[PDB]
């Protein structure tokens with residue numbers, strides 16, 4: 243049970259800090275960029291949660307149907323990215339996406355020597371990380387309204403899963 | 418061994434990305450701020466490693482003898498690197514780029530868990546392990562390793578002997 247620690251640290255050390263002042267930075271972004279961040283439910287931080295823990299080494303979104311646009315503006319600095327989402331080769335939405343990056347730590351633990359093992363143990367920990375985070379956010383409702391958790395599991399083969407569809411799905415059911 | 422995972426993650430997802438570009442941002446900083454970042458061995462990222470894992474909730478340095486001045490500018494991630502002046506007997510004694518190795522906060526949280534996630538002793542061990550693993554990693558990338566220094570210590574939980582500012586100055590003054 244380190245998913246506990248990971249979630250508390252990711253809340254206390256990051257989410258706790260950025261969520262309160264997200265609307266103001268979003269305001270500044272939309273003043274700067276002529277209201278590019280737009281569409282209902284688009285004024286929120288979408289935190290990607292791949293249970294497979296497939297966060298890229300660079301921690302950024304890398305997907306051919308997801309194109310980076312610009313950053314949110316800014317006592318320290320935050321690196322929140324705004325992407326346009328493609329659907330059938332057309333811009334279908336715009337949103338702020340980022341990976342819940344401590345999932346990377348879980349993938350790393352699954353590669354360790356022989357001890358740090360089991361894809362199954364990692365999956366379970368990721369779920370645990372997720373629900374723990376959700377349980378934390380439940381108690382800070384005003385700030386919880388500033389983000390949404392997109393939980394899924396990317397398969398390791400086949401072509402069925404689409405991260406961009408997954409996001410569009412989540413946005414289109416803002417209920 | 419979550420220390421192993423934490424370290425590789427801290428390297429791959431953070432250090433690997435900022436260390437090669439630090440000197441350029443340092444150049445930019447010192448064009449802006451008239452060579453404030455100054456003193457031999459001050460052009461480096463000092464990473465604080467408290468084995469106690471006493472990283473503050475807000476992740477910043479919070480010490481009465483360490484005063485924030487300004488941020489490093491950006492080189493596309495955005496990076497948050499703080500430059501502080503160190504005080505010695507009420508007088509500015511040096512300037513440096515300091516930050517906590519923040520994965521250590523994860524270890525503190527694991528030690529507070531329910532009853533299972535336990536042991537100040539198991540956290541100390543993992544912290545050292547995190548540290549030595551990270552050292553092993555940096556050893557392989559010597560050029561970028563030259564851009565940072567690990568400041569490893571253990572802040573006691575009581576008494577007044579420990580001083581983070583003196584710790585830093587000792588590290589800067591005795592850099593050979």
Ligand SMILES: Nc1nc2c(ncn2[C@@H]2O[C@@H]3COP(=O)(O)O[C@H]4[C@@H](O)[C@H](n5cnc6c(=O)[nH]c(N)nc65)O[C@@H]4COP(=O)(O)O[C@H]3[C@H]2O)c(=O)[nH]1
Nearest residue numbers: 252255256318319321343344427430431495496497519520
């Ligand atoms: N991904 C990662 N980053 C690390 C790690 N250790 C230290 N950092 C860095 O600490 C820098 C400063 O913290 P921050 O300004 O408050 O702003 C930080 C900080 O609030 C946050 N952060 C702190 N701890 C964690 C954590 O345990 N997990 C995650 N996902 N984010 C964290 O990431 C924010 C933004 O990132 P940056 O601006 O680029 O720069 C951040 C962040 O990248 C690590 O193990 N993994």
